[PDB]
Design a protein around this ligand. Structure first.
Ligand SMILES: Nc1ncnc2c1ncn2[C@@H]1O[C@H](COP(=O)(O)OP(=O)(O)NP(=O)(O)O)[C@@H](O)[C@H]1O
Ligand SMILES: [Mg+2]
Ligand SMILES: [Mg+2]
Length: 299
């Protein structure tokens, strides 16, 4: 931090104590965020922000440099061929993907499968020229469970069928049981703390993203307070995904909010499930057929 213009030993201590340990967080911070650190002037805050931006090279880019930025995105396999294809490779890091669907369509199953797949290095697709092995080493997941449906037995089972160690998944997955939107949102904001503690959080799951908000803001009169709260939640999720190059997955039961990739899942015959991609930034709408068995997601 002292490398930053105007930042000395004392200021650096104030910053690290306020959660600002890396340059990107400072480079992308508002003057308000820093000035509120107390002892950090608005003039110094402005100087270090401008300084961090330059150190991080946050300016105009064009040509081949545009491709380089896009290549920092790695993708996680869903264990389904059709689904990975519809996704253009797999679940994207630096974006939020929503799996919406009717009761029992498999939203939670997909969340569990992703936690398991994170521990199979062959399921993380990336360009080794833009993404180093070190960046995706010892990956960990965070599962914010707002429904109470996290099931360690299912993790063990899916892991077994995938040929990987179930306990290893459990050891590298953090679960937080949230009973309301306040806890849900706070846990999400605390993920940055886990990373500062040395945990390479590469997958974040929110199951469910919308349940608490709906139960708390039923009265369709104060829909403003609700949309404001959820919007701030989503903004935190998107920034977290971008800054820490990780995959953010969220579920939503449906029989409006921001999400970069949107799926609607319904049941097929028995084992069968059909997931319709109806919104993404660069892909055409398409449907993927897969199944959910004791092995987890397959086909
Ligand atoms: N161990 C398992 N073996 C085979 N199928 C399983 C297993 N566990 C779960 N399933 C399937 O997963 C279905 C439930 O999927 P689930 O992910 O909970 O749907 P959901 O969308 O999250 N439901 P909800 O949260 O209520 O809206 C079951 O009813 C089973 O068919
Ligand atoms: Mg993003
Ligand atoms: Mg569920």
């Amino acid at each position: 931090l002292t490398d930053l213009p105007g930042v000395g030993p004392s200021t650096a201590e104030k910053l690290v104590e306020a959660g600002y340990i890396d340059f990107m967080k400072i480079a992308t911070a508002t003057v308000g965020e820093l000035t509120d650190i107390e002892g950090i002037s608005e003039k110094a805050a402005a100087k270090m922000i401008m300084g961090a931006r330059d150190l991080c090279d946050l300016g105009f880019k064009s040509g081949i440099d545009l491709l380089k930025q896009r290549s920092t995105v790695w993708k996680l396999s869903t264990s389904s061929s059709e689904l990975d294809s519809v996704l253009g490779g797999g679940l994207e890091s630096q974006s939020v993907t929503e799996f919406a669907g009717v009761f029992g369509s498999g939203k939670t199953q997909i969340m569990h499968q992703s936690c398991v797949n994170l521990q199979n290095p062959e399921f993380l697709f990336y360009d080794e020229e833009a993404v180093s092995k070190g960046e995706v080493a010892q990956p960990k997941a965070v599962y914010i469970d707002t429904e109470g449906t996290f099931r360690p037995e299912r993790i063990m089972q899916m892991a077994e069928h995938a040929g990987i160690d179930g306990q290893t998944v459990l050891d590298n997955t953090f679960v937080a049981r949230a009973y309301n939107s306040d806890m849900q949102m706070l846990f999400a904001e605390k993920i940055e703390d886990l990373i500062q503690e040395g945990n390479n959080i590469k997958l974040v799951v929110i199951d469910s993203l919308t349940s608490t908000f709906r139960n708390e803001y039923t009265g369709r009169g104060k829909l403003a307070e609700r949309q404001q709260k959820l919007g701030r939640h989503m903004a935190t999720l998107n920034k977290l995904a971008d800054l820490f190059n990780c995959v953010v997955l969220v579920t939503n039961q449906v029989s409006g909010h921001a999400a970069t990739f949107r799926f609607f899942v319904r049941k097929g015959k028995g084992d069968k499930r059909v997931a319709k991609l109806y919104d993404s930034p660069h892909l055409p709408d398409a449907e993927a057929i897969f199944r959910i068995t004791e092995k987890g997601i397959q086909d």
